[PDB]
């Protein structure tokens, strides 16, 4: 019953991409029982140097709806409330790469996801730094597998960001999660997470930001 | 100022696919100024014979946010409140096809979209009738062009529905819209509509249904 109700969420990211330093603070709430996520992110350091869509996977998979018969495969919720470290190496096809480390744990009533991001090799003529990506999102299947030795899971999927000239920027994701505590955690059978995401703005919001709504449901078992 | 506020929406579809007759009633509201759409659809004839995702494009493009400098390209809103007839021939790659005719007009305070759908050639072993499609949606760019002679627009795009085995069902859309009134309507320059859609369920909803949230913004000018 840690996630049985609507849980408040706080996201804090400090990043660095080709020297361009910035920060993003996010607020929202998620309903696990429904896999619904509702968040708002403001770029507290001015104008975001990178497209908002490229930070979507970075800025809380524990809010996924795991159907009843899969509750024994929910590593995310089983690491709570102590948490898990989420690391990723995301490769933007024919452009730079992001390296992010984040710890997502409960801090009282709020589920907090603190992250650090470093991105490099981004061409200044590229989609990413060129800001040639459209403000929208597709739906992908996120693949999970247990990592026995490390006592976590290995996750992996490819994101397809849309470019304004009907092209598609691919972004390969290499993700790993380990619990932060020493208590046993649920190591799951192979399965994926079907996730849908939608980006919108906010009229009454003056600062640079992104509104993100997202639905996630576990499957493959 | 017909669409300046939140407008209520009513969708009514009666369909026939390979003989399987059914009806879908939908309710919701849209905010044009924001391009946000929020609708809920119930299958009033029992269990929907076709996957809910295949009816998404069928079940009100006048709720798109047309940035200020494009208000002269908004055919949809310029046909109001009298309306427009929206016809489509959608071809499901390697499977059947849908033929839908719908009139969408204002009926008092509510924007009503009444539709008739006939689908044929759907293989019983196919994705569609086989219900092998996942309950989710991608984002596509809907292409508009004026149709001088007919006094409307020709619209066209391809939808990529996801299949549970990481495949992609393509669905070619051939759409045409003509005003219902004889007053002059705005014929637009070529441009597209960037649309994002997300499907979800509803806990307190017992009947067969689909919850659809959708963001649309005009571009290409």
Swiss-Prot record, chains A, B:
Instruction: Tell me the impact of changing residue 198 to K.
Output: Abolishes the tendency to dimerize and leads to monomeric fluorescent proteins
Outcome of residue 185 to A?
Answer: In mut1.5; shifts fluorescence lifetime from 3.03 to 2.72 ns
GO BP annotations, alphabetical order: bioluminescence; generation of precursor metabolites and energy
Among SUPFAM superfamilies, the record links this protein to:
GFP-like
The keyword Oxidoreductase appears for this protein? no
Going by the UniProt record, its keywords in alphabetical order are: Chromophore, Luminescence, Photoprotein
Which effect does the record note for changing residue 195 to Y?
Gives rise to yellow-emission variants. In EYFP; leads to yellow fluorescence, folds faster and more efficiently at 37 degrees Celsius and has superior solubility and brightness
The record gives the effect of mutating residue 195 to H/W/F as: Results in significantly red-shifted excitation and emission maxima
According to the record, mutating residue 137 to F results in: In Sapphire/H9-40; exhibits a huge Stoke's shift, with an excitation peak at 399 nm and an emission peak at 511 nm. In Azurite; shifts the excitation and emission spectra to shorter wavelengths and increases quantum yields compared to BFP
Question: What InterPro entries does the record tag this protein with?
Answer: GFP, GFP-related, Green_fluorescent_prot
The entry's stated outcome for residue 60 to L is: In EYFP; leads to yellow fluorescence, folds faster and more efficiently at 37 degrees Celsius and has superior solubility and brightness
Q: How does it assemble?
A: Monomer.
User: This protein is called what?
Assistant: Green fluorescent protein
Name the species this protein comes from. Answer: Aequorea victoria
């Amino acid at each position: 019953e840690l996630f049985t109700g609507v849980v408040p969420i706080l996201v804090e990211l400090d990043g660095d991409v080709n020297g361009h330093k910035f920060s993003v603070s996010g607020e929202g709430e998620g309903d696990a029982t429904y896999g619904k996520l509702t968040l708002k992110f403001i770029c507290t350091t001015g104008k975001l140097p990178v497209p908002w869509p490229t930070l979507v996977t970075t800025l809380v998979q524990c809010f996924s709806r795991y159907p009843d018969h899969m509750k024994r495969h929910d590593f995310f919720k089983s690491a709570m409330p102590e948490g898990y470290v989420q690391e990723r190496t995301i490769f933007f096809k024919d452009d730079g790469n992001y390296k992010t480390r984040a710890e997502v744990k409960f801090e009282g009533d709020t589920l907090v996801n603190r992250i650090e991001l470093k991105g490099i090799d981004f061409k200044e003529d590229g989609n990413i730094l060129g800001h040639k990506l459209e403000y929208n999102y597709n739906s992908h299947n996120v693949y999970i597998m247990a990592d026995k030795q490390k006592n976590g899971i290995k996750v992996n999927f490819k994101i397809r960001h849309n470019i304004e000239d009907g092209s598609v920027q691919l972004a390969d994701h290499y993700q790993q999660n380990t619990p932060i505590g020493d208590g046993p955690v649920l190591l799951p059978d192979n399965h994926y997470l079907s996730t849908q995401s939608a980006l919108s703005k906010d009229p009454n919001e003056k600062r640079d930001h992104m509104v993100l709504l997202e639905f996630v449901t576990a499957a493959g078992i």
